Symmetry: C2
Subunit: 152 residues, 2 copies
Amino acid sequence: TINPTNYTLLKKQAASLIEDEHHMIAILSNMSALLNDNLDQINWVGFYLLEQNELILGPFQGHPACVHIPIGKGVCGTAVSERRTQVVADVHQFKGHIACDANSKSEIVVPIFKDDKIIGVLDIDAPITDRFDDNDKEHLEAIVKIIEKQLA
Amino acid sequence: TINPTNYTLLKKQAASLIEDEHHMIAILSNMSALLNDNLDQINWVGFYLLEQNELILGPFQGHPACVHIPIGKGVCGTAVSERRTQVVADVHQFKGHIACDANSKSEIVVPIFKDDKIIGVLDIDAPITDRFDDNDKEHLEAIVKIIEKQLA
């Protein structure tokens, strides 16, 4: 059972923990908390930042995670190499999953852009399979757009 | 009722999410998770970084928090101005508490040093009063020392 999220109001709330803020780390830290507090059936939510040609762990809500993820490897790295959101119904069956993805049963990763360049990703993992659908994808991408506008 | 923490083993574990790592944000993000997973009766645990003469919210586990905290104000700001750990049994009775400290009933804030300069603080809040004692203070300061050594 997956309790639904009122994404319409969530977008407005996100705009708050973002507006008038220019410290990216603070924005990402608070955003990870906001999403964690409003999404049911998830076990990890946070960000990875592209630094020195690899993904580096940023602010998140959940258990400790791998710090480095290569571009093109793992669910997160693949989101970067494909330059598009990844909605994974079953991580164990995802072509390219790595040991660092072990605790994720289903997942969604949305790339974050800045001047046509991917600067990181929003990663949300779930303890059950098929947690995310097209509706979640649309709303989460919209939330990422709000973040992008603030960081721009 | 406060369940005890095996700080002796926790220090060893912390050394892990820290060793061979040079990205401070990743270190702080994972450390906030490690502490959250091993401390009972707390509602917020994370870091604030000193940037442009004020504290700026960094990685943490919990609900959204204030991004800016002035030096010398609030429990966290006071830890910086006094340049020493603050163990607060009752935040509501703490001289200098601010609106941003509202959800914290008791708290401990440990300043983090780098070349004799305070670069931030470790902040842990609890939903009950008198959560932290001298024993917690000693062990948490030791953990902060491990973080300092890695960032040095």
